[PDB]
Amino acid sequence: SSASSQEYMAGMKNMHEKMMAAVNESNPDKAFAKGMIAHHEGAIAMAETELKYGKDPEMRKLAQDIIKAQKGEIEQMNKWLDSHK
Amino acid sequence: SSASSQEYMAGMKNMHEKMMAAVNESNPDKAFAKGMIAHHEGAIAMAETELKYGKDPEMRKLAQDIIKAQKGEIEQMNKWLDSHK
Ligand SMILES: [Cu+2]
Ligand SMILES: [Cu+2]
Ligand SMILES: [Cu+2]
Ligand SMILES: [Cu+2]
Ligand SMILES: [Cu+2]
Ligand SMILES: [Cu+2]
Ligand SMILES: [Cu+2]
Ligand SMILES: [Cu+2]
């Protein structure tokens, strides 16, 4: 019922819907690509929520590292999907 | 219904349950920790599935990078969880 828990669930919903679409890919490489994008966007969403509501400095710093790390992997992946269909 | 799609859904099923459990945490820092563990286990399962069915060399290499990189990162999360309440 809290705002942080409400924000975690909204991020999960978005990740879940995109994850199901990825499982619906017959090409396993396209499923992996689609899947990992939804995974990375979910981790950015969890980390942004942790940076907004979390109070532990160890978790807060881990969340910042995650936001930076998950962007470079989405980059190459979007290209692979855009150059295959 | 394909074997690869069925193995992707099995990992998604696993990640979704633990993700929902993480969202149900009232402590937003514990939700983040549980959430990221569920993300790491979900990314490993996708990559293991990609290593078994995938044919593209780039994704398979990306999936191997995931298994190697995401192995040490769960450790620090369980350590944080096991020393907090
Ligand atoms: Cu909920
Ligand atoms: Cu569902
Ligand atoms: Cu579904
Ligand atoms: Cu997935
Ligand atoms: Cu299914
Ligand atoms: Cu559900
Ligand atoms: Cu639920
Ligand atoms: Cu999550």
TrEMBL record, chains A, B:
Occurrences of domain DUF305 (ranges): 1-81
Superkingdom of this protein's organism: Bacteria
Assigned keywords, A-Z: Plasmid
Protein name (record): DUF305 domain-containing protein
Species, as recorded: Escherichia coli
Taxonomic lineage: Bacteria, Pseudomonadati, Pseudomonadota, Gammaproteobacteria, Enterobacterales
Shown chain mapped onto the complete sequence: 49 to 133 of 133
